[PDB]
Amino acid sequence: RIIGKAVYDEMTVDCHFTRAFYKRVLSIPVDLTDVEALDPEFHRSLVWILENDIENVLDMTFSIEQDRFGITEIIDLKENGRNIAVTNENKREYVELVCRFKLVRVIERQLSAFAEGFFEILDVDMLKMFNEKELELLISGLPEIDVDDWRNNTIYFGYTSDSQVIRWYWRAVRNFSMEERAKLLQFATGTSKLPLEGFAGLRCQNGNQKFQIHKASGGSSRLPTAHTCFNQLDLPEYDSYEQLVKALLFSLEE
């Protein structure tokens, strides 16, 4: 109710949240990057399972071993799912359903209550046509971020400050509007909150961490992948500024 009234009252709040919260608010399925942020181990296991033909040596049931101290009650992820093993055809289904039920289910009642409070204060139809990244900018505000402050407090890995690829990336960010800058920051960091000190005192999930740009060691057509846990920007090799800026725009817009 408070957030709905704040958006109704055109009021900027300090209510910054994760991706899954707004995704369930917007009824958008939760992506694997959120699970990657909380645990790179399970993300690595899931991407390895999906990429490879693990059906040959799978021998796994659909249900996941979730402990409850006293005794483990088998909570099926689907109807009669214990009798259904993981196969190649539905490996994506298993991965996405495990991602959904690992964190959302223990929070699903809270999200339902928040949706009940929020949707009775704002229109469902007019807002449902937006994305989860735009919801953070809608609620917490669309800040005007300083590219100079960003680049002056940023270290680079795999390149230098005078490297051509890094200069092209910073030129693209300079040409990025407050829309594009905010969405790129959300992609790279996972939040729209701008510290008063700026990128000098930027912090991540694992404590303080200035902005870092890693090398993806991939092809030219490869798209950058960001880890919101460490504020790591995997900037791959590129051939021209146009391809780099198009890739960055596709990554931020998604």
Short mmCIF file of N, CA, C and O in Angstrom, two decimals, residues 72-155:
data_model
loop_
_atom_site.label_atom_id
_atom_site.label_comp_id
_atom_site.label_asym_id
_atom_site.label_seq_id
_atom_site.Cartn_x
_atom_site.Cartn_y
_atom_site.Cartn_z
N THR A 72 12.65 -34.96 6.78
CA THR A 72 12.49 -34.40 5.44
C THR A 72 11.17 -34.87 4.85
O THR A 72 11.03 -36.05 4.49
N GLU A 73 10.20 -33.97 4.75
CA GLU A 73 8.94 -34.24 4.09
C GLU A 73 9.12 -33.93 2.61
O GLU A 73 9.49 -32.81 2.24
N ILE A 74 8.85 -34.92 1.76
CA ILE A 74 9.10 -34.77 0.33
C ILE A 74 8.07 -33.81 -0.25
O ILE A 74 6.90 -34.18 -0.45
N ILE A 75 8.49 -32.58 -0.51
CA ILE A 75 7.62 -31.56 -1.10
C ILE A 75 7.83 -31.59 -2.60
O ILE A 75 8.86 -31.13 -3.11
N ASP A 76 6.85 -32.12 -3.33
CA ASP A 76 6.98 -32.27 -4.77
C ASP A 76 6.88 -30.91 -5.46
O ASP A 76 6.04 -30.08 -5.10
N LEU A 77 7.75 -30.69 -6.44
CA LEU A 77 7.70 -29.46 -7.23
C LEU A 77 6.57 -29.47 -8.25
O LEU A 77 6.25 -28.42 -8.81
N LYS A 78 5.97 -30.63 -8.51
CA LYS A 78 4.83 -30.73 -9.41
C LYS A 78 3.96 -31.90 -8.95
O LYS A 78 4.28 -32.58 -7.97
N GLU A 79 2.87 -32.14 -9.66
CA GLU A 79 1.96 -33.23 -9.30
C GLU A 79 2.58 -34.57 -9.68
O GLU A 79 2.87 -34.81 -10.86
N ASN A 80 2.77 -35.43 -8.68
CA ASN A 80 3.38 -36.75 -8.88
C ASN A 80 4.74 -36.63 -9.55
O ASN A 80 5.10 -37.43 -10.42
N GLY A 81 5.52 -35.63 -9.15
CA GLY A 81 6.82 -35.40 -9.74
C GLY A 81 7.91 -36.31 -9.23
O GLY A 81 8.97 -36.40 -9.85
N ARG A 82 7.68 -36.99 -8.10
CA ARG A 82 8.68 -37.91 -7.57
C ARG A 82 8.91 -39.07 -8.53
O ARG A 82 10.04 -39.56 -8.66
N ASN A 83 7.86 -39.52 -9.21
CA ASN A 83 7.97 -40.60 -10.19
C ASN A 83 8.56 -40.14 -11.52
O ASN A 83 8.86 -40.99 -12.36
N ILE A 84 8.72 -38.83 -11.72
CA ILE A 84 9.24 -38.28 -12.97
C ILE A 84 10.68 -37.85 -12.75
O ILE A 84 10.97 -37.03 -11.87
N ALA A 85 11.59 -38.41 -13.54
CA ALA A 85 12.99 -38.03 -13.49
C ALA A 85 13.27 -36.89 -14.46
O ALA A 85 12.43 -36.53 -15.30
N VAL A 86 14.46 -36.31 -14.35
CA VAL A 86 14.86 -35.20 -15.20
C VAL A 86 15.36 -35.75 -16.53
O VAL A 86 16.21 -36.65 -16.55
N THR A 87 14.83 -35.22 -17.62
CA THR A 87 15.17 -35.68 -18.96
C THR A 87 15.67 -34.52 -19.81
O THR A 87 15.64 -33.36 -19.39
N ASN A 88 16.15 -34.85 -21.01
CA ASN A 88 16.66 -33.82 -21.92
C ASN A 88 15.55 -32.89 -22.39
O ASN A 88 15.77 -31.68 -22.54
N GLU A 89 14.36 -33.43 -22.64
CA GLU A 89 13.26 -32.61 -23.15
C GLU A 89 12.83 -31.55 -22.13
O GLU A 89 12.56 -30.41 -22.51
N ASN A 90 12.76 -31.92 -20.85
CA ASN A 90 12.28 -31.02 -19.81
C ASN A 90 13.38 -30.60 -18.84
O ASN A 90 13.09 -30.30 -17.68
N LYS A 91 14.64 -30.58 -19.28
CA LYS A 91 15.71 -30.09 -18.42
C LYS A 91 15.54 -28.60 -18.12
O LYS A 91 15.78 -28.16 -16.99
N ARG A 92 15.11 -27.82 -19.11
CA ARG A 92 14.83 -26.41 -18.88
C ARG A 92 13.70 -26.24 -17.88
O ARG A 92 13.76 -25.36 -17.00
N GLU A 93 12.65 -27.06 -17.99
CA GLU A 93 11.55 -27.01 -17.03
C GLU A 93 12.05 -27.30 -15.62
O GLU A 93 11.69 -26.58 -14.68
N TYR A 94 12.88 -28.33 -15.46
CA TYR A 94 13.39 -28.66 -14.14
C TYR A 94 14.24 -27.53 -13.58
O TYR A 94 14.10 -27.16 -12.40
N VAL A 95 15.12 -26.96 -14.40
CA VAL A 95 16.00 -25.89 -13.94
C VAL A 95 15.19 -24.68 -13.51
O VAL A 95 15.38 -24.12 -12.42
N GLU A 96 14.24 -24.25 -14.36
CA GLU A 96 13.46 -23.06 -14.04
C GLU A 96 12.56 -23.29 -12.84
O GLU A 96 12.38 -22.39 -12.01
N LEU A 97 12.01 -24.50 -12.69
CA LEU A 97 11.14 -24.77 -11.55
C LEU A 97 11.93 -24.85 -10.25
O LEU A 97 11.43 -24.41 -9.21
N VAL A 98 13.14 -25.41 -10.29
CA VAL A 98 13.99 -25.40 -9.11
C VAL A 98 14.37 -23.98 -8.74
O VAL A 98 14.36 -23.61 -7.55
N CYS A 99 14.70 -23.14 -9.73
CA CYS A 99 14.99 -21.74 -9.45
C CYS A 99 13.78 -21.04 -8.83
O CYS A 99 13.93 -20.25 -7.89
N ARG A 100 12.58 -21.32 -9.34
CA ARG A 100 11.38 -20.72 -8.80
C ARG A 100 11.11 -21.16 -7.36
O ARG A 100 10.85 -20.32 -6.50
N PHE A 101 11.19 -22.46 -7.08
CA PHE A 101 10.80 -22.98 -5.78
C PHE A 101 11.92 -22.92 -4.74
O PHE A 101 11.66 -23.22 -3.57
N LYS A 102 13.14 -22.56 -5.13
CA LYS A 102 14.22 -22.47 -4.16
C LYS A 102 14.10 -21.23 -3.27
O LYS A 102 14.40 -21.30 -2.07
N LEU A 103 13.67 -20.11 -3.83
CA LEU A 103 13.63 -18.86 -3.07
C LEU A 103 12.25 -18.22 -3.05
O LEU A 103 11.88 -17.62 -2.04
N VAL A 104 11.48 -18.33 -4.13
CA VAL A 104 10.19 -17.65 -4.19
C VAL A 104 9.18 -18.31 -3.25
O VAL A 104 8.41 -17.62 -2.58
N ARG A 105 9.17 -19.64 -3.19
CA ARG A 105 8.14 -20.33 -2.41
C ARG A 105 8.19 -19.95 -0.93
O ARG A 105 7.14 -19.71 -0.33
N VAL A 106 9.38 -19.90 -0.34
CA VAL A 106 9.51 -19.45 1.05
C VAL A 106 9.25 -17.96 1.19
O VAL A 106 9.20 -17.45 2.32
N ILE A 107 9.07 -17.25 0.08
CA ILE A 107 8.74 -15.83 0.09
C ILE A 107 7.43 -15.55 -0.64
O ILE A 107 6.99 -14.40 -0.69
N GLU A 108 6.78 -16.59 -1.16
CA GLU A 108 5.62 -16.40 -2.03
C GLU A 108 4.46 -15.73 -1.30
O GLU A 108 3.76 -14.88 -1.87
N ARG A 109 4.22 -16.11 -0.04
CA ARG A 109 3.14 -15.48 0.72
C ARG A 109 3.41 -14.00 0.91
O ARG A 109 2.50 -13.17 0.82
N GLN A 110 4.67 -13.64 1.19
CA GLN A 110 5.03 -12.24 1.36
C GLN A 110 4.83 -11.45 0.07
O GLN A 110 4.31 -10.33 0.09
N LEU A 111 5.23 -12.02 -1.07
CA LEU A 111 4.98 -11.37 -2.35
C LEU A 111 3.50 -11.25 -2.66
O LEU A 111 3.07 -10.24 -3.23
N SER A 112 2.70 -12.26 -2.31
CA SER A 112 1.26 -12.17 -2.52
C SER A 112 0.64 -11.06 -1.68
O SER A 112 -0.21 -10.30 -2.15
N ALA A 113 1.08 -10.94 -0.42
CA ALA A 113 0.60 -9.85 0.42
C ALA A 113 1.01 -8.49 -0.13
O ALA A 113 0.21 -7.55 -0.15
N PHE A 114 2.26 -8.38 -0.59
CA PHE A 114 2.71 -7.13 -1.18
C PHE A 114 1.92 -6.79 -2.44
O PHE A 114 1.61 -5.62 -2.68
N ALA A 115 1.62 -7.80 -3.26
CA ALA A 115 0.82 -7.57 -4.45
C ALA A 115 -0.59 -7.13 -4.10
O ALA A 115 -1.17 -6.27 -4.77
N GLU A 116 -1.17 -7.72 -3.05
CA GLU A 116 -2.49 -7.29 -2.60
C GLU A 116 -2.47 -5.83 -2.15
O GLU A 116 -3.38 -5.06 -2.47
N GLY A 117 -1.43 -5.44 -1.41
CA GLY A 117 -1.32 -4.05 -0.99
C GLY A 117 -1.08 -3.10 -2.14
O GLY A 117 -1.66 -2.01 -2.20
N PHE A 118 -0.21 -3.49 -3.08
CA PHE A 118 0.24 -2.61 -4.15
C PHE A 118 -0.79 -2.45 -5.26
O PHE A 118 -0.98 -1.35 -5.79
N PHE A 119 -1.47 -3.54 -5.63
CA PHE A 119 -2.37 -3.52 -6.77
C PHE A 119 -3.72 -2.88 -6.47
O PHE A 119 -4.46 -2.56 -7.40
N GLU A 120 -4.05 -2.68 -5.20
CA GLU A 120 -5.26 -1.95 -4.83
C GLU A 120 -5.03 -0.44 -4.77
O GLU A 120 -5.99 0.30 -4.52
N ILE A 121 -3.80 0.02 -4.99
CA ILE A 121 -3.48 1.43 -4.99
C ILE A 121 -3.11 1.93 -6.38
O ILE A 121 -3.21 3.13 -6.66
N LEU A 122 -2.67 1.04 -7.26
CA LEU A 122 -2.37 1.40 -8.64
C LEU A 122 -3.07 0.45 -9.61
O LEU A 122 -3.48 -0.65 -9.23
N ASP A 123 -3.19 0.89 -10.85
CA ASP A 123 -3.85 0.09 -11.88
C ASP A 123 -2.96 -1.07 -12.31
O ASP A 123 -1.78 -0.89 -12.60
N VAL A 124 -3.55 -2.27 -12.35
CA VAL A 124 -2.82 -3.44 -12.80
C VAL A 124 -2.56 -3.38 -14.30
O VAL A 124 -1.45 -3.66 -14.77
N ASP A 125 -3.58 -3.01 -15.08
CA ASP A 125 -3.48 -3.06 -16.53
C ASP A 125 -2.44 -2.08 -17.05
O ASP A 125 -1.65 -2.40 -17.95
N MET A 126 -2.41 -0.87 -16.49
CA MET A 126 -1.56 0.17 -17.06
C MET A 126 -0.09 -0.08 -16.73
O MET A 126 0.80 0.33 -17.48
N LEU A 127 0.18 -0.78 -15.62
CA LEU A 127 1.53 -1.04 -15.17
C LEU A 127 2.06 -2.41 -15.60
O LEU A 127 3.28 -2.60 -15.63
N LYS A 128 1.18 -3.35 -15.96
CA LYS A 128 1.62 -4.70 -16.29
C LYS A 128 2.45 -4.75 -17.57
O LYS A 128 3.12 -5.76 -17.81
N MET A 129 2.42 -3.71 -18.39
CA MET A 129 3.18 -3.67 -19.63
C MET A 129 4.63 -3.21 -19.44
O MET A 129 5.29 -2.87 -20.43
N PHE A 130 5.13 -3.21 -18.21
CA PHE A 130 6.48 -2.79 -17.89
C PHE A 130 7.31 -3.99 -17.44
O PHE A 130 6.78 -5.06 -17.14
N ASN A 131 8.63 -3.79 -17.40
CA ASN A 131 9.57 -4.84 -17.03
C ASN A 131 10.06 -4.64 -15.60
O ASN A 131 9.85 -3.60 -14.98
N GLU A 132 10.73 -5.68 -15.08
CA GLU A 132 11.18 -5.65 -13.69
C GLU A 132 12.25 -4.59 -13.47
O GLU A 132 12.29 -3.95 -12.41
N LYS A 133 13.14 -4.40 -14.45
CA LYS A 133 14.17 -3.38 -14.30
C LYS A 133 13.57 -1.98 -14.27
O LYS A 133 14.08 -1.10 -13.57
N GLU A 134 12.50 -1.75 -15.03
CA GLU A 134 11.83 -0.46 -15.02
C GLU A 134 11.00 -0.23 -13.76
O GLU A 134 10.66 0.91 -13.46
N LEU A 135 10.66 -1.30 -13.03
CA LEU A 135 9.87 -1.13 -11.82
C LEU A 135 10.70 -0.51 -10.70
O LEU A 135 10.19 0.30 -9.91
N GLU A 136 11.98 -0.89 -10.60
CA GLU A 136 12.86 -0.25 -9.62
C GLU A 136 13.02 1.23 -9.92
O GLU A 136 12.99 2.06 -9.01
N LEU A 137 13.20 1.58 -11.20
CA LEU A 137 13.27 2.99 -11.58
C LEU A 137 11.94 3.69 -11.36
O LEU A 137 11.91 4.91 -11.15
N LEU A 138 10.83 2.95 -11.43
CA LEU A 138 9.52 3.55 -11.22
C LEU A 138 9.27 3.85 -9.75
O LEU A 138 8.69 4.89 -9.41
N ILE A 139 9.71 2.97 -8.86
CA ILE A 139 9.44 3.11 -7.44
C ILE A 139 10.49 3.96 -6.74
O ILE A 139 10.17 4.94 -6.07
N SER A 140 11.77 3.59 -6.89
CA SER A 140 12.85 4.31 -6.23
C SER A 140 13.27 5.57 -6.98
O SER A 140 14.02 6.38 -6.43
N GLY A 141 12.81 5.75 -8.22
CA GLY A 141 13.18 6.90 -9.01
C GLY A 141 14.19 6.55 -10.09
O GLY A 141 14.87 5.52 -10.05
N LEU A 142 14.28 7.43 -11.09
CA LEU A 142 15.22 7.28 -12.19
C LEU A 142 16.36 8.26 -11.99
O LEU A 142 16.28 9.41 -12.44
N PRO A 143 17.44 7.86 -11.31
CA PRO A 143 18.48 8.83 -10.95
C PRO A 143 19.31 9.27 -12.15
O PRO A 143 19.40 8.59 -13.17
N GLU A 144 19.91 10.45 -12.00
CA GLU A 144 20.86 10.98 -12.98
C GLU A 144 22.26 10.64 -12.49
O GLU A 144 22.75 11.25 -11.53
N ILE A 145 22.90 9.68 -13.14
CA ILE A 145 24.17 9.13 -12.67
C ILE A 145 25.32 9.82 -13.39
O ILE A 145 25.22 10.15 -14.58
N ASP A 146 26.41 10.06 -12.67
CA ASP A 146 27.58 10.74 -13.21
C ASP A 146 28.52 9.72 -13.83
O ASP A 146 29.10 8.89 -13.12
N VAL A 147 28.68 9.79 -15.15
CA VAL A 147 29.62 8.90 -15.84
C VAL A 147 31.05 9.22 -15.42
O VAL A 147 31.89 8.32 -15.33
N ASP A 148 31.35 10.50 -15.18
CA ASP A 148 32.69 10.87 -14.73
C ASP A 148 33.00 10.24 -13.38
O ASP A 148 34.10 9.70 -13.17
N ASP A 149 32.05 10.29 -12.44
CA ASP A 149 32.25 9.65 -11.15
C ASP A 149 32.36 8.13 -11.31
O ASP A 149 33.12 7.48 -10.58
N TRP A 150 31.61 7.56 -12.25
CA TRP A 150 31.68 6.13 -12.51
C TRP A 150 33.07 5.72 -12.97
O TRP A 150 33.68 4.80 -12.42
N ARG A 151 33.59 6.40 -13.99
CA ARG A 151 34.86 6.01 -14.59
C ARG A 151 36.06 6.41 -13.75
O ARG A 151 37.11 5.76 -13.82
N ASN A 152 35.94 7.47 -12.94
CA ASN A 152 37.06 7.91 -12.13
C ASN A 152 37.31 7.00 -10.93
O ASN A 152 38.41 7.03 -10.35
N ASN A 153 36.33 6.19 -10.55
CA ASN A 153 36.44 5.28 -9.42
C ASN A 153 36.24 3.84 -9.87
O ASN A 153 35.59 3.04 -9.19
N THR A 154 36.80 3.49 -11.03
CA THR A 154 36.63 2.17 -11.62
C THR A 154 37.99 1.61 -12.01
O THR A 154 38.80 2.30 -12.64
N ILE A 155 38.24 0.35 -11.65
CA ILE A 155 39.42 -0.37 -12.08
C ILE A 155 39.02 -1.29 -13.23
O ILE A 155 37.86 -1.68 -13.38
#
